[PDB]
Amino acid sequence: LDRSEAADTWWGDKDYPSSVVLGIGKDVPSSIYGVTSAIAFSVGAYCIAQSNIINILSGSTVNGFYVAGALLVPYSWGLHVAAWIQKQNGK
Amino acid sequence: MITDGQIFVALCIALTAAILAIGLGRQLYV
Amino acid sequence: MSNDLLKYLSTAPVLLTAWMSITAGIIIEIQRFFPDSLSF
Amino acid sequence: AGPMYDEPLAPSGMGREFINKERAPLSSYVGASQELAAFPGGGGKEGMAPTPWDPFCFSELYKVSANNPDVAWLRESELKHGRMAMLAITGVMVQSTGFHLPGNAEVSFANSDWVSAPTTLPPVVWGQVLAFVAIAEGQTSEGLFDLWLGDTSKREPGNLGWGSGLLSKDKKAADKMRLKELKNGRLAMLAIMGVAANHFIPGALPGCIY
Amino acid sequence: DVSGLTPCKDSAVFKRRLDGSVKKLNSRLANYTEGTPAYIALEQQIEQTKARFAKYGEKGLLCGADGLPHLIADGRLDHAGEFIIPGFGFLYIAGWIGWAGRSYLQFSKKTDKPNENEIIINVPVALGMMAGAFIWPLAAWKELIDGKLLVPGDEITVSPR
Amino acid sequence: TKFPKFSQALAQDPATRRIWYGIATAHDLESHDGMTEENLYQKIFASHFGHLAIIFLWTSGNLFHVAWQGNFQQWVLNPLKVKPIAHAIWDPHFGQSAIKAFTRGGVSYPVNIATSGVYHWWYTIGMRTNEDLYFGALGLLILSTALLFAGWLHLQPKFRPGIAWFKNNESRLNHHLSGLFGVSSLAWAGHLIHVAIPESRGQHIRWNNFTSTLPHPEGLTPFFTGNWGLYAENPDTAQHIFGTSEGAGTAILTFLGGFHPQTQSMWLTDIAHHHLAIAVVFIFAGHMYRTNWGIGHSMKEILDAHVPPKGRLGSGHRGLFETITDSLHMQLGLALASLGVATSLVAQHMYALPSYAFMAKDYVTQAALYTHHQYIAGFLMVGAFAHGAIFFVRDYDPEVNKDNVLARMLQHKEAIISHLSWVSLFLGFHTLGLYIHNDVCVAFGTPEKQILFEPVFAQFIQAASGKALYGFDVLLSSPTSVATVAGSKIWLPGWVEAINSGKNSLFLTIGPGDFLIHHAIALALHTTTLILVKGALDARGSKLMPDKKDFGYSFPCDGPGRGGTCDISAWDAFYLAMFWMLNTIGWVTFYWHWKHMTIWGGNAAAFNESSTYIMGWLRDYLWLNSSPLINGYNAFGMNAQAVWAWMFLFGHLIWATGFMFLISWRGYWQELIETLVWAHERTPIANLVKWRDKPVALSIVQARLVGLAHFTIGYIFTYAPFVIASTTGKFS
Amino acid sequence: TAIKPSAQVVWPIVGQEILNGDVGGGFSGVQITSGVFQMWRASGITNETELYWTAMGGLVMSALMVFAGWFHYHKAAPKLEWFQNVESMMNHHLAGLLGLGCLSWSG
Ligand code: CLA
Ligand SMILES: CC1=C(/C=C/C(C)=C/C=C/C(C)=C/C=C/C=C(C)/C=C/C=C(C)/C=C/C2=C(C)CCCC2(C)C)C(C)(C)CCC1
């Protein structure tokens, strides 16, 4: 990737960042971002709790579909940050 | 027990590496 | 004695020596009267 | 070039003029208390003293740096702590009498120990309470970084919009109600922290019953 | 009890150390006769050693496996006297010293000859600053609030960045 | 066409400094005459190829020498008694007594006893005979040959890569993380599962039968069905003997934790699972950046739009991409800092969690490896800071970094330097004061008055990790804790026994001596960072010299004007911080070596009692353990440690010779050389032989460099014989 | 032969009284190594009153030297012509200082 092939994303003067920083998610509405963030956080917390807390994680038997979904907690964080960004962008 | 022939073929490979190192040094100098 | 000797005694090294001798005396006498105080 | 003794380290054209502008004073906030100015000679009326109380001058610490919060933020935090402490002291007082919700096989709300009352509940029951508090404190908080640097514009300190219409239209009566709020909140803060201190170390509050 | 330590009262190694020190002095004691200055001085030495060990036992210090006091500095008030109380004492004294120095510098600069006032101290006012620095925490707070503790940032030289 | 062809100025230089400066500026390709960026990058690429060839030649040489002259096959049978042999000695200066003394290790010729752990490493990864070592040496030789050919090839006209290709950051980072790290770690996991676990379990898997032999009885059917726990089922038993089928399991990927009981080293199944998992993580990480398809990330965009609100960090990270991708010195500094941190990490982790069989009982190898890697970590950290300073003085553009996160560092450099000075002064004052207080208290026969502070926070961390002797009862030390309950079924059953077992270096017990020495280490690190940070930040300029950037990185001075300007160039801040690097690593290695020597001797009370005062440090560590070294040769005879004694006194000599260059400066020697020039020119006969380069005294920076090199080399060559010879003589 | 010479005693303040080691003769102090004891034995001093009185005499001489230094700069300072009489100075230092010093010590 060359230095020229890069959009101007700097937003220090502005109060909020442009939607270009979201990449492919620039056009995603804020309501969809927020509701998906809530669903993702709930599902990931449920998966981690059922993997480690409710059942103590045994090496012989780990579900895998609970290991997946545990990654949605960072995804939920990103989704709610993007929800805020889209809310301030009015998009 | 490493054999004399084994040491000799290893020495031959080392000499090849020496020649290549000399060539690389010359090309770096120029 | 005079203003001149008072100024000389007020010079920096004389005052430092006197003050640090006073401080060392205070510390030494405190050690004499409350010896071996590892904690409050 | 502003109220602060130093220019903010935030740069020009990226916040400096926003931080270093004029900010409202402590005297323009409804917190004065006649009780402190309750002595012969100088004194106040209608429950308010002529001047506010600030021996440590935390209100005007912004002039040293913009790291320190503004009086808008301090009033927001004061009203938040007061409201939370009022609910907390009312809750402990009501719970210690033994009154509790009906309950069922799954949940048992019967516990007079306010310190360990949440521990008795199932994970879901207190989980809902904490989740509601987490969502609301976080949704209602918009423009709080603006109250820190001082821009009481978008957000008034303590005005979440919940029941703000019931405030009287007269300025005097509105300020009277706000002062009643602040006084009850501060009393409840002292009460709840005193009960907690009495629990942790006995004898901290001699008038305790809990 | 913390970190496996025990009090020095019930410390066999601490008691053994006390007896060893006492036995060492009493041995050295054999060279001198009764009633001499050296003999009475060594008797003072033995008494001070025993008093030190008794005081260390009574003070509640924790003695480790090596049989020496160990100081706990984490914040627990059970061992406040080890660090917290001496810490505040030193902080007060050091702030006193710094405040006396700062206030004398503030005075001496206003003088007609600050360079000579630094190497020849005006003792009559210097003692005044040393006395007045006793209330430094309130004075420092007042000067901070009044903007007279810190010099602004662009009034102090700074090198070319 | 003089020797410094790259430097016309040095070519025209008529004195003897031409040779010195040409040699020391040979590799400073950025400042060479008639140099372009593309040629610079291509020459760097070729030099990298040559360097890789040298590394592989060194490895192949070690392997060949152990195969040919080493007792690897004998050592395999009895690892804990046979001493590994590095290589044979050929020396026509040896006497008969020397030959007899150096004849050891169950061989008929003089030899050197290896202290690098290569025997343990090769035995663990599954080398069993000299033939395997010889074939590995041949493979490494062929690899070096290929790398040298590649280095030659990529300087050719049609094969010279371009500047855009060199500056393609996204593709490089994608591949060097998904292939160089990820796929290579996956390959190592495959090697373990295919060759190392079978060899530890008594199976001879080599190239002629690794295709036929299955790593697991089930094969890949569990892997494709998703029943991956079958590979963890049936782990190795606690009665297993390394290299034998008795007590051997069938698991290939496990998470037992702890240590293998016989070897006191980590399980090979655990290591294979580690490398497999981390390879998966690296391969996932390496798809982050955008390369030719559309998916990915743009590092320029990320850096540009990472700026916090209201200008907290100024303009944020704007321009950092440009400065980093343009300046090679910043990249070099970041790489050196990361590699120094990694070297410190491996030094700290090898002793705590040994991975190679029977290395825990090999005390000499452990100390040698720890000292080695700690010293290299210090060198790499100093280099990282030095190249950061070079970047500031050479490659920093304030126009690009207009109000940048990097420019604000220069903005508040005065505050940074003052606070580093404060913390250094505080730590030094109070650490030295407590040490001297303890010294005087013990000196006056009253140790009870010592100020002994228990490292309560470190002990708390040990308890949280699983230690129980302190009685804190927190987290994993508490049986009821949710953390213990969660981890109880995977790794804690092994980890708890490993940490609580007292025969191991995992989370050593600590005390007041540990408190004091750790605060001394903090002092030394903060002071080294102070010197290096001040050099880097004042490299551009200062109040005594605002135009330092015009003079550059390494210049002698600005003259005696303005009160004197000695050691102002910020190369002199490398020079001065190298002393503190040597100091801090010396303190760290002294601490490690003494605390481990006492524990190996089962005499930890000596460290716990005497480490609290400097007289105890000088008496019970240096003076006590220096006897077997200095007695390597004496009037009555000589032992195998005579070489180590000679070297101790040789490192002493080099260290002392460095003081000459560091103390005496150039004018004295220039006048002396003028007198010698007069004498040579005026004597008869000898005046017929006449120099070509006019002899001159060494330059100021040249002599600073030479004195520092003498200091450092004497340091290492006088500490290495001590740490090896004393440990060998005591065998504990 | 048996007694260790010692002429310094430390006060007991911070446990430094341990430095007052056993030097013999029922005396505790810091052992000296200046040879002054053997010097005085050669000189013939056998009691302490002699040491006390020569110490007082030395104090008187020190005061006299301070007075002379004050007098020869502030009251009656010589001239460069006086200073440059090197021949007379050598005569007085050979015959007068060294010669009479040796004669008096021999007596
Ligand atoms: C291909 C690589 C690989 C293989 C063959 C194994 C094999 C094994 N692992 Mg696993 N493991 C791996 C990678 C791998 N692991 C990685 C990358 C991690 C994260 C660091 C782990 C972490 C891990 C732990 C903590 C434990 C195991 C254990 C096990 C055993 C049973 C697992 C099981 O039944 O899962 C069956 C699951 C599936 C068939 C589906 C998995 C699909 C995943 C979730 C897809 C997404 C991956 C994700 C993006 C990668 C990043 C990691 C992220 C989760 C943070 C078995 C020996 C257990 C064991 O041996 O205990 C003694 C155990 O306790 N593994
Ligand atoms: C001058 C300069 C430079 C240089 C620099 C340097 C040299 C640096 C270094 C640095 C360093 C060297 C750093 C380091 C750091 C570190 C850190 C920051 C860490 C962290 C950590 C963490 C975070 C952890 C955590 C954890 C975990 C994860 C687990 C366990 C627990 C714990 C908590 C521990 C450069 C080149 C850039 C350029 C510019 C200038």
Side-chain angles (χ1 to χ4, degrees), chain F residues 507-534:
Chain F
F507 279 115
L508 303 152
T509 310
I510 47 170
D514 303 82
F515 171 93
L516 285 161
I517 184 56
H518 277 83
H519 278 75
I521 287 153
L523 155 63
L525 285 180
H526 277 87
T527 301
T528 319
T529 319
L530 161 58
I531 302 156
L532 292 165
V533 164
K534 187 203 148 291

Side-chain angles (χ1 to χ4, degrees), chain D residues 61-83:
Chain D
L61 249 177
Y62 73 71
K63 296 169 190 166
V64 182
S65 158
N67 285 333
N68 310 283
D70 192 10
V71 180
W73 176 276
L74 296 172
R75 172 52 50 84
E76 176 65 7
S77 64
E78 188 186 46
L79 277 161
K80 188 165 274 158
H81 291 110
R83 289 162 189 169

Side-chain angles (χ1 to χ4, degrees), chain A residues 57 59 62-64 67-68 71, chain F residues 223 226 228-229 231-232 253-255 273 276-277 280-281 284 490-491:
Chain A
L57 185 68
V62 309
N63 165 329
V67 177
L71 291 165
Chain F
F223 182 84
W228 292 8
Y231 296 135
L253 300 152
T254 71
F255 212 142
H273 192 187
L276 177 57
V280 166
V281 175
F284 263 100
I490 308 166
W491 55 71

Side-chain angles (χ1 to χ4, degrees), chain D residues 5-6 56-58 60-61 64, chain E residues 141 144-147 150 152-153:
Chain D
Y5 307 119
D6 175 19
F56 281 93
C57 301
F58 290 120
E60 62 195 350
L61 249 177
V64 182
Chain E
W141 189 259
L144 182 78
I145 292 290
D146 305 345
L150 299 169

